[PDB]
Amino acid sequence: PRPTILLVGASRGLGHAMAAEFLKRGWDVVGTVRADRGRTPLHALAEAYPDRLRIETLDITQPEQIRALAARLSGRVFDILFVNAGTTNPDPTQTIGEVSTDDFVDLMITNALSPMRVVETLAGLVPRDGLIGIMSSGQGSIADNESGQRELYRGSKAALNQFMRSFAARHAQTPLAMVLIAPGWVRTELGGPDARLSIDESVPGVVDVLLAKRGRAGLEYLDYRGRTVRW
Amino acid sequence: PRPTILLVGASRGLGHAMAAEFLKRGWDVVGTVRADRGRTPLHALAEAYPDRLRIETLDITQPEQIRALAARLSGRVFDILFVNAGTTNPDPTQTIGEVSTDDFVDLMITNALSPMRVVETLAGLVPRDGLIGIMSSGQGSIADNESGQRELYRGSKAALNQFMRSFAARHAQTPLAMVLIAPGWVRTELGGPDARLSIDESVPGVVDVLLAKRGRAGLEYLDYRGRTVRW
Ligand SMILES: NC(=O)c1ccc[n+]([C@@H]2O[C@H](COP(=O)([O-])OP(=O)(O)OC[C@H]3O[C@@H](n4cnc5c(N)ncnc54)[C@H](OP(=O)(O)O)[C@@H]3O)[C@@H](O)[C@H]2O)c1
Ligand SMILES: NC(=O)c1ccc[n+]([C@@H]2O[C@H](COP(=O)([O-])OP(=O)(O)OC[C@H]3O[C@@H](n4cnc5c(N)ncnc54)[C@H](OP(=O)(O)O)[C@@H]3O)[C@@H](O)[C@H]2O)c1
Ligand SMILES: [Cl-]
Ligand SMILES: [Cl-]
Ligand SMILES: [Cl-]
Ligand SMILES: [Cl-]
Incomplete structure (x- = not known):
C-alpha cells in the first residue's frame, strides 16, 4: 500500500537520484531504463x-514500448508519474x-514529442x-532567454512546455496536478563540470516540490526551490 | 516488445479464456495445447x-516435451509463466x-508432479x-476441507500447493512473484453444468489478480476475487 512514483528515465543522473530520494522518504519506485x-x-x-x-524498460522514442509499459503496468496505480528522460544534441x-536535420529531428523527438506521448499514454495509471x-529546464523559458547558447536544446524544452500547456488546457477545471520542473544547473553528465549545483543541492528540493504540488490542481512551471519560472 | 505470457494448457476452458482475456489487455500470448x-x-x-x-505443443506429463518446449523458446523472455493444465479422475x-492405483497415479502425476516440472524447467524463461x-483450486486448501467430496482431486491439489510452497522457499531471496490461483467453481467441462460461475465471471478476475500480483515478490494463494485462500 506504499505510495508509488512511476519515474520514467531513472538509470542515472537526476532520475536515479530522484529514485533514491523517494525511497528514503518511504515511497516505492517503479523506474525505467533503456534496454541498451x-x-x-x-x-x-x-x-x-x-x-x-522495480526496474522496467522503456526508450521513450519508441511508441510501441510506451504501449508495452502501459500494458505491463495496467494492474497498478501510481500517485505520481514523472518523466525525467531527456538529452541534448x-x-x-x-x-x-x-x-x-537529423540532430534537429532527434532532439525534438526525444525532448518534446516523446515525453508528451509518455504522459498522454500513461496518464491513466495516475488517479x-x-x-x-x-523534467523541463530553465533553458526552455522563452521570457528568460536573454543569452542564447544551447540553441537546439532551448527550443526543444520550449516546445515541450508549450505542448504541456495544451495538455493542461484539456484538463482545465479538473483536480489533476501537473508540473514542469526546472532542476537548476546540476553537475551531472549533461550539466557538465561548470554546473552550479551538486545533485544533492537540487534533487531534495525537486522532491519537496513534487510532494507539495500534489493536490494543487493545474499546471505550474516550478524550479527546484518552488519558484515560478516565467514561460 | 509487448509483454508476453507463456500460458501452459490453453486449449479449452479457463485456459482458452485466459488467453482471450490477456489479448484484450494488450498482452501477447504463447499458449500450449496437446498435439494429439x-x-x-x-x-x-x-x-x-x-x-x-502463438500456439505451441506440450503434454505436461512428458518431460521430453517440456525440455523440447524450453529449447524451442530459447532466447525468449516471458513476463508471466502460468500453468493452467489440470484434470480430475x-x-x-x-x-x-x-x-x-492407476487412477491415483494418473491424477497425482497430471495435477501435482507435472505442473511443478513445467515450472521448474521453464522458470529460466521468466525474469x-x-x-x-x-491454477490450483479452492479444493486444495486443507484448512478449508470441512466437507470432503472429490477426494482424489483434493489430495492432488493439496500436494501441488505444498510443492509450490517449497519451490517458493528456494526463491525467498529473489524478487520472484508466485501465485496459486483458485478460480472458483466454473461451468467448464471439468466444473460441470451445475457449477456456480460462468467462465466470464471468473477469468477477468483471475487476470486482474495476475496483473496486480506482478511486482509483489513471494508466493500467495489467491482466488479470482483477490482473496487469500487458507492453506
Ligand atoms: N543537469 C542539468 O543541469 C539539467 C538542467 C535542466 C534540466 N535538466 C533535465 O533533467 C533531465 C535529466 O538530465 P540529467 O542531468 O540527469 O542527465 P543525464 O545524467 O544525462 O541523464 C539523462 C537521463 O535521461 C534518460 N534518457 C535520455 N533519452 C532517453 C530515451 N530516449 N528514453 C529513455 N530514457 C532516456 C537517460 O537514460 P540512458 O542512461 O539510457 O541514457 C538518463 O536516465 C533531462 O530531462 C534534462 O533535460 C538537467
Ligand atoms: N472448472 C472449475 O470449476 C475449476 C475449479 C478450480 C480449479 N480448476 C482448475 O482449472 C484448470 C483448468 O480446468 P478447466 O475447468 O478449464 O477444465 P477443462 O475445460 O477440462 O480444461 C483442462 C485444460 O487442461 C489441459 N490439460 C489437461 N491435462 C493436460 C496435460 N497432460 N498436458 C497438457 N494440458 C493438459 C487441457 O488440454 P486438452 O484440451 O488437451 O485436454 C485443457 O486445456 C485445472 O487446473 C483445474 O484443476 C477448475
Ligand atoms: Cl532511461
Ligand atoms: Cl533548470
Ligand atoms: Cl492443453
Ligand atoms: Cl476454486
Missing part, C-alpha cells in the same frame, strides 16, 4: 531496495542554423487527482 | 489474433479407499522479477 545501457546506477540501487524499487554549441510531472 | 488433441478453441482464437497469439465420487503462477 547495460548495468546502470539504478540496477545497483535496486539491489539495496529489492522489495521497493551531439554539438550544443551549434546554432539552429548549423545543426543537421484523476494525481500528479503528472515532466 | 487436433484443433482446439485456441486455434479459433488464433485466427482472430494471428500476430499476437474418471469417477470423482470415489473415496480415497476406493480409487484404483528474476517475473511472475510464475499455477
Whole structure:
C-alpha cells in the first residue's frame, strides 16, 4: 500500500537520484531504463531496495514500448508519474542554423514529442487527482532567454512546455496536478563540470516540490526551490 | 516488445479464456495445447489474433516435451509463466479407499508432479522479477476441507500447493512473484453444468489478480476475487 512514483528515465543522473530520494522518504519506485545501457546506477540501487524499487524498460522514442509499459503496468496505480528522460544534441554549441536535420529531428523527438506521448499514454495509471510531472529546464523559458547558447536544446524544452500547456488546457477545471520542473544547473553528465549545483543541492528540493504540488490542481512551471519560472 | 505470457494448457476452458482475456489487455500470448488433441478453441482464437497469439505443443506429463518446449523458446523472455493444465479422475465420487492405483497415479502425476516440472524447467524463461503462477483450486486448501467430496482431486491439489510452497522457499531471496490461483467453481467441462460461475465471471478476475500480483515478490494463494485462500 506504499505510495508509488512511476519515474520514467531513472538509470542515472537526476532520475536515479530522484529514485533514491523517494525511497528514503518511504515511497516505492517503479523506474525505467533503456534496454541498451547495460548495468546502470539504478540496477545497483535496486539491489539495496529489492522489495521497493522495480526496474522496467522503456526508450521513450519508441511508441510501441510506451504501449508495452502501459500494458505491463495496467494492474497498478501510481500517485505520481514523472518523466525525467531527456538529452541534448551531439554539438550544443551549434546554432539552429548549423545543426543537421537529423540532430534537429532527434532532439525534438526525444525532448518534446516523446515525453508528451509518455504522459498522454500513461496518464491513466495516475488517479484523476494525481500528479503528472515532466523534467523541463530553465533553458526552455522563452521570457528568460536573454543569452542564447544551447540553441537546439532551448527550443526543444520550449516546445515541450508549450505542448504541456495544451495538455493542461484539456484538463482545465479538473483536480489533476501537473508540473514542469526546472532542476537548476546540476553537475551531472549533461550539466557538465561548470554546473552550479551538486545533485544533492537540487534533487531534495525537486522532491519537496513534487510532494507539495500534489493536490494543487493545474499546471505550474516550478524550479527546484518552488519558484515560478516565467514561460 | 509487448509483454508476453507463456500460458501452459490453453486449449479449452479457463485456459482458452485466459488467453482471450490477456489479448484484450494488450498482452501477447504463447499458449500450449496437446498435439494429439487436433484443433482446439485456441486455434479459433488464433485466427482472430494471428500476430499476437502463438500456439505451441506440450503434454505436461512428458518431460521430453517440456525440455523440447524450453529449447524451442530459447532466447525468449516471458513476463508471466502460468500453468493452467489440470484434470480430475474418471469417477470423482470415489473415496480415497476406493480409487484404483492407476487412477491415483494418473491424477497425482497430471495435477501435482507435472505442473511443478513445467515450472521448474521453464522458470529460466521468466525474469528474476517475473511472475510464475499455477491454477490450483479452492479444493486444495486443507484448512478449508470441512466437507470432503472429490477426494482424489483434493489430495492432488493439496500436494501441488505444498510443492509450490517449497519451490517458493528456494526463491525467498529473489524478487520472484508466485501465485496459486483458485478460480472458483466454473461451468467448464471439468466444473460441470451445475457449477456456480460462468467462465466470464471468473477469468477477468483471475487476470486482474495476475496483473496486480506482478511486482509483489513471494508466493500467495489467491482466488479470482483477490482473496487469500487458507492453506
Ligand atoms: N543537469 C542539468 O543541469 C539539467 C538542467 C535542466 C534540466 N535538466 C533535465 O533533467 C533531465 C535529466 O538530465 P540529467 O542531468 O540527469 O542527465 P543525464 O545524467 O544525462 O541523464 C539523462 C537521463 O535521461 C534518460 N534518457 C535520455 N533519452 C532517453 C530515451 N530516449 N528514453 C529513455 N530514457 C532516456 C537517460 O537514460 P540512458 O542512461 O539510457 O541514457 C538518463 O536516465 C533531462 O530531462 C534534462 O533535460 C538537467
Ligand atoms: N472448472 C472449475 O470449476 C475449476 C475449479 C478450480 C480449479 N480448476 C482448475 O482449472 C484448470 C483448468 O480446468 P478447466 O475447468 O478449464 O477444465 P477443462 O475445460 O477440462 O480444461 C483442462 C485444460 O487442461 C489441459 N490439460 C489437461 N491435462 C493436460 C496435460 N497432460 N498436458 C497438457 N494440458 C493438459 C487441457 O488440454 P486438452 O484440451 O488437451 O485436454 C485443457 O486445456 C485445472 O487446473 C483445474 O484443476 C477448475
Ligand atoms: Cl532511461
Ligand atoms: Cl533548470
Ligand atoms: Cl492443453
Ligand atoms: Cl476454486
